[PDB]
Write a protein that binds this ligand. Structure first.
Ligand SMILES: *[C@H](O)CCCCCC
Ligand SMILES: *[C@H](O)CCCCCC
Lengths: 255, 255
């Protein structure tokens, strides 16, 4: 039924500034009883897309209703225009996510088991999710990119309002074959026999990264990595991602 | 040293509604290392006065600055116009404070030791502080009423904007000898051999309640209860309580 909506602001030693962070914490009966041990909750790291921040998932979906139904803690950080990268000219936003994961597991009643921790996100956050799935596999059991960018050149060459490509990648004019390419990180993951989280890849059929998503899931089957692809009517809007994260949260908590 | 500013909104099972709550959580090095076990922080329960709520101590003082220098967590809840009582016609806001206490000790890295937990507050919060000090002495080692109300008839018969006495005490025609009388709770604490927390009572000398404060500390001395009383130039405003809460926070965490 109920839960806590928590808004944090702390000085980050990683990115060197105060930063906002919002956390959904569903209510457990352990939390109100002083004589019982706390039961740790499953936790979702939820990554916003470009132009969004730590507030927009709460504002534009009804995710806390979905999270309280399945008693899932949700962590929503803010990474600005970074594409979740340790930026060449800017903040160390790849490392910031591992700091956010470490902090809220130390301070909130969250379970540190691999089988209890998930990660998801949309657009840039979906591209962020597939980066951490392929590079931080022992931290997360399942990963759900929604309408992700899988060929990062489409995100880097995107002409978005005040978006700075050179701030992330520096003087490089291609991201193919580097730590920004999910195809390279996928190749390195199968090469080193690294744990890949359980993949649920969601994208609306009328999205523009739909064909971007079709290329990625086909590449996954050619290298024998299991996934689950759910399509259907949808565009690149919070109307899709509201319904998508509702089915996504139900998918991750039941196994 | 830096810290986290945390604002919670959860459905409270005690008062039967969603309620806002603010938390200062100073940063320890423990919080960012997952190979470290978390060292729990000292905790202060900070109670606002009449017409205020959970936001006003941050807005009108610099308490998070003072709390972070002394690594002290600060818990600031909202109790409306209740005078921290289980109201006859209203919410059970006495029990709510025990619920807030139980909730943040379970979900935040706070020390559950008696010598690490203090309680404080101004005006009506000073009335709440001395009510919980004399009836929950096992939960607090130090209690700091600032500019407080000790003669409960002065608060019940107060003509403040929209304040309702009968919502608190109902048809009662005097507070003496009841659970609303802090002098009565002091007698019952002495008689039942209940541990009285260490008291620091502060009131400015131009306050209306200065003579009210002298009557309680005079009575306190007459039944052989130790206290420390600090006075000086001060009035009934957040300018005095900003400077006083800095003095109180330094007093409570040392020795
Ligand atoms: C990503 O957050 C949304 C912008 C669309 C990117 C298409 C490459
Ligand atoms: C206390 O919260 C502020 C009002 C002054 C009360 C004096 C009886």
């Amino acid at each position: 039924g109920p839960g806590a909506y928590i808004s944090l602001n702390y000085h980050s030693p990683t990115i060197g500034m105060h930063q906002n962070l919002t956390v959904i914490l569903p209510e457990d009966q352990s939390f109100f009883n002083s004589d019982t041990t706390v039961k740790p909750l499953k936790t979702l790291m939820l990554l916003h897309g470009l132009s969004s921040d730590e507030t927009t998932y709460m504002r534009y979906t009804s995710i806390e209703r979905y999270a309280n139904e399945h008693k899932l803690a949700v962590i929503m950080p803010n990474v600005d225009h970074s594409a979740y990268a340790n930026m060449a000219y800017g903040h160390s936003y790849y490392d910031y996510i591992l700091e956010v994961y470490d902090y809220v597991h130390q301070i909130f009643p969250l379970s540190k088991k691999r089988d209890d921790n998930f990660i998801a996100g949309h657009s840039m956050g979906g591209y962020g999710t597939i980066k951490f799935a392929l590079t931080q596999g022992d931290k997360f059991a399942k990963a759900v990119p929604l309408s992700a960018v899988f060929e990062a050149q489409n995100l880097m060459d995107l002409e978005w309002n005040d978006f700075s490509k050179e701030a992330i990648i520096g003087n490089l004019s291609s991201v193919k074959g580097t730590e920004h390419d999910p195809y390279y990180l996928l190749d390195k993951a199968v090469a080193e026999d690294k744990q890949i989280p359980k993949l649920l890849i969601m994208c609306g059929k009328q999205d523009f990264l739909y064909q971007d998503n079709l290329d990625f899931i086909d590449y996954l089957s050619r290298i024998n990595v299991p996934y689950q692809f759910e399509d259907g009517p949808g565009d690149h809007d919070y109307a899709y991602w509201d319904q998508a994260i509702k089915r996504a949260i139900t998918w991750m908590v039941n196994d």
